[PDB]
Amino acid sequence: AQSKRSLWDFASPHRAQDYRRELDTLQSLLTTSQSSELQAAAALLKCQQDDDRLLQIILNLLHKV
Amino acid sequence: HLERLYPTAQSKRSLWDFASPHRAQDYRRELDTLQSLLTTSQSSELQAAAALLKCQQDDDRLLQIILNLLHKV
Amino acid sequence: GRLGEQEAFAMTVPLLIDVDSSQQEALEAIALNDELVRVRRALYLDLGVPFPGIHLRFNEGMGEGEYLISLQEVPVARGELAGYLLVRESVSQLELLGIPYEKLPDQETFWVSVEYEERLEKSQLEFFSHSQVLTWHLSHVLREYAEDFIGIQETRYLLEQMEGGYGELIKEVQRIVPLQRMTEILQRLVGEDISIRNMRSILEAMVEWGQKEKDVVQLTEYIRSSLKRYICYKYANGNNILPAYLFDQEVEEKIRSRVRQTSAGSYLALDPAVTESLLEQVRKTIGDLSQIQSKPVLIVSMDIRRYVRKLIESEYYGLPVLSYQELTQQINIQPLGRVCL
Amino acid sequence: KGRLGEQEAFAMTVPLLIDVDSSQQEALEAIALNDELVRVRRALYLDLGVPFPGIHLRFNEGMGEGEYLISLQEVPVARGELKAGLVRESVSQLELLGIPYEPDQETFWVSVEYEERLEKSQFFSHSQVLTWHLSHVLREYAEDFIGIQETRYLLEQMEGGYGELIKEVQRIVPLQRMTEILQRLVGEDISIRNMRSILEAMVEWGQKEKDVVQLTEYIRSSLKRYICYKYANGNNILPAYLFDQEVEEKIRSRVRQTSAGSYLALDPAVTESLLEQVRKTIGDLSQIQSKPVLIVSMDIRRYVRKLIESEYYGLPVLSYQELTQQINIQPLGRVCL
Amino acid sequence: ITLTKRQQEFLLLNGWLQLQCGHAERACILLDALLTLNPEHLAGRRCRLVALLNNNQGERAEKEAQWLISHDPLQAGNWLCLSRAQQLNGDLDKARHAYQHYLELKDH
Amino acid sequence: TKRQQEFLLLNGWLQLQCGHAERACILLDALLTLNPEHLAGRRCRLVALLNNNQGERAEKEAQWLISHDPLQAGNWLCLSRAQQLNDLDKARHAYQHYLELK
């Protein structure tokens, strides 16, 4: 309801090709660190890094003409 | 008409107008003369210029071969 | 109203512009009804695409400076124009720090107050007002989404408008190619920023080459090659000078090896790694030169020209791709660099 | 006017446009500016027969003072700034050094006070230079003025004259092939004006040949006396640069009639060598006069022409079949291999 | 040493294209060779000023703009090159002065 | 981590918006351990903990935001929710405080 929307508004805080190698830099930064929290973050980032590698390969194989 | 609504960066236009200063076969002729003139030289700057001219002289030789192979009637 | 009437069907508006309120009468009487037609007319004269009517509405539900442009009731360009009393600048740089004043799909945008307008116009910089920024966004939307304005109805209207001019030419081109192929050809032409305006040569090329080729790609390549002098004037700068980034034979052969004309599509899928390597080679040779001028064009073999363009459309949306046949004579093509393998 | 509900208010592009600078709206036009253009267009049509379109003349103040541009279908094809404001001369040479001193011609500019004395020496005015550029544009771009509509208009204009001839030629060959043949004929500066013989040749040879190149070669051969008179100003004397049998066979070896294109693609080195031999024999043609013509076998004539069109755009190419009798063919030199 | 002929214009045209087609280093090399052979030419230095500005060589652009300012008379675009080059190196005040001088001269 | 921190904030917000909330919790915990000044990450992870049913930690984080950022009335919903996950009377008191602030 309205209260749930207020919860989401409380949680609420560039675009398009801003998504670049910033992810890769952060993943390699956190890979060095020995903190367990940063290690979990790095593994999550690697997961998304490879799901993105799979979707880029699928888009390259399909494309359009 | 030709989307003439953007002044296109007046400072850049003044730069290009300051920088602002043709034929068909005179170009290839000047290329060959300049490349053979600069080959005799000895300066490093003239050596880089000569290598650039040879580069364009042979990219043009490749495009001339492509144009010769392609044709109409 | 009645609960027995079926639905009262109504068609979706093709083009809609929804801007915030408090500019219903604060903005009115300052262009907004002549500027829009002016920019649409200029873009049509430059291209020839029959753009539709523009519906302008003032909505109070949104904020104060939010404008959205939607094609067929789906928003395609939103933005909050800052804007109320801050006019924008597109060439903002450290020069804008040199003249110290307070400081989007457009270029680098920074907003300055109207009290600074006099001293900054003494420097003769960009002063896009509300009308100017709105029409700039409208022009960009129309240019990048013109393919959606070329339907069967639009092409039929174009043919009917030219019936008095060239009757037998239209009757011949209709008997040679159907409306669907002709409209697809026009859409492909506009997708490459090639103007439809000169319809006579387009129809003559359609007549000449529609009897020989049935594939859409080859036919549209022939129609492009029929516009040699138009393409030369549009892309070449200076005198008879055309900047080029010609491709090596090995790279052209590698690209051509995977045309894949299987289902009348002919999609170019070679290998993701191989295309990545080729794009890396193109980036290493060509470079970036985005800040630079003169619009260099890539020149490649005609049979693969389109296939090359969509290969580099992702990164180099600027750089056009041209065919050797599309080049007219008396042109001094200067090779800026060969894309090696 | 265009409301924001009107679709586009479509308007067709002008075929031919000439945009000249302002300050000559009333400073110029003293001579004709509106009669000279039609005069030169009519003369060029009588020479060729191509139905040139209407010419739109506009004075634009956004440009300089002596800038004139000629554009075909709103695409500029010949731009230039005349410096007369100072009439020009096309036969300028070192003779101009022994006289008051200072396109594709020797273009030097002289003042109007010298006009009397230069006329004692023995003159392109503003109208003359504008019409000279217009004439060059029309002659070198006449193929773009021959469309399906233009050929249909020509046929409809001659219906009263030769009805059965037109009805037969229409039933024998289509409009597209006929228009392409007419454009190919005009590309060699062959006049369409004499339409009767062209239509008769089309009727006679359209049932036998379907390839455009061979059919247009036959139609060219149907104009033997016209070609002979056009290229032989003397008394049955025709300068020739005849081809050797070996060169003709080598050229014919790569006709490549695969996709109704008929492209002549030899090895680039082979074409370079043949062009070098032709250049060595013929020469530079700069100091050559009387308009010598190359004569070669008919079946490859066009194939030779487009081979030498890049360098010797002047020198025409003719077929042996196109040669009528009572001609003294004088061989200026054989193109050896 | 050497000679100029019409060739000197070729170096300009190629250099101009190299500047306008994202090859600042190539344009700089061509115009430096031209000036090292024939230093008397002036348009080549005008092109190389913009080439040096686009190449990010502030000191060289400032020196060339100083030469042209001391040899090219008024109304020249020699005060933009100075402004752009020096503002890349710092010293924003002299860039402001050059810009104000350019604005004052362009009113004519 | 001046821009990168914004990438982390956006990723955490999107993960919260897409039902996981565990990934958002770990990302925002890493963000706070690196940059603690950017309290927006804690603001998001509070709701993430509420949706994760970890009200014991959520109460402490909501107390931090309440005692350090009294510029948000929403700091009194999360605490209430947290205590409602674990204390109904104190939840009513927090809700009434939020009503007083709004």
Swiss-Prot record, chain B:
Main location: secreted
UniProt superkingdom: Bacteria
Disulfide bond residue pairs: none
Coiled-coil residue spans: 22-38
Localization of this protein: Secreted
Alphabetized UniProt keyword annotations: Coiled coil, Plasmid, Secreted
Protein induction: Temperature seems to play the major role in regulation of transcription of the lcrE-containing operon of pYV, whereas Ca(2+) concentration has only a moderate effect at 37 degrees Celsius, and no effect at room temperature.
Keyword Secreted: yes
GO cellular component, one term: extracellular region
Subunit and interaction comment: Interacts with YscY.
This protein's domain notes: The region between residues 50 and 110, which contains the predicted coiled coil domain, is essential for interaction with YscY.
Additional remark text: May possess both an mRNA signal and a syc-dependent signal capable of directing its export through the type III secretion system.
Function: Required for Yop secretion.
Record protein name field: Yop proteins translocation protein X
Organism per entry: Yersinia enterocolitica
From Swiss-Prot, chain D:
UniProt superkingdom: Bacteria
Localization, UniProt: Cell inner membrane
Keywords, ordered alphabetically: Cell inner membrane, Cell membrane, Membrane, Plasmid, Protein transport, Transmembrane, Transmembrane helix, Transport, Virulence
Chief location of this protein within or outside the cell: membrane
This protein's record includes keyword Transport: yes
Gene Ontology biological process: protein secretion
Keyword Transmembrane helix recorded: yes
SS bond partners: none
Any single GO CC term annotated in Swiss-Prot or TrEMBL for this entry: plasma membrane
Function according to Swiss-Prot or TrEMBL: Could be involved in the secretion of the yop virulence proteins.
Protein family: Belongs to the FHIPEP (flagella/HR/invasion proteins export pore) family.
Full protein name: Low calcium response locus protein D
Gene field: lcrD
Portion of the full-length sequence here: 358 to 704 of 704
Curated annotation (Swiss-Prot), chain F:
Organism whose genome encodes this protein: Yersinia enterocolitica
SUPFAM superfamilies with a match to the protein in the record: TPR-like
Keyword Cytoplasm: yes
Localization: Cytoplasm
Major site of localization recorded for this protein: cytoplasm
Induction: Temperature seems to play the major role in regulation of transcription of the lcrE-containing operon of pYV, whereas Ca(2+) concentration has only a moderate effect at 37 degrees Celsius, and no effect at room temperature.
UniProt GO cellular component terms: cytoplasm
Protein role: Required for Yop secretion. Functions probably as a chaperone which stabilizes YscX within the cell, before its secretion.
Name used for this protein in its record: Chaperone protein YscY
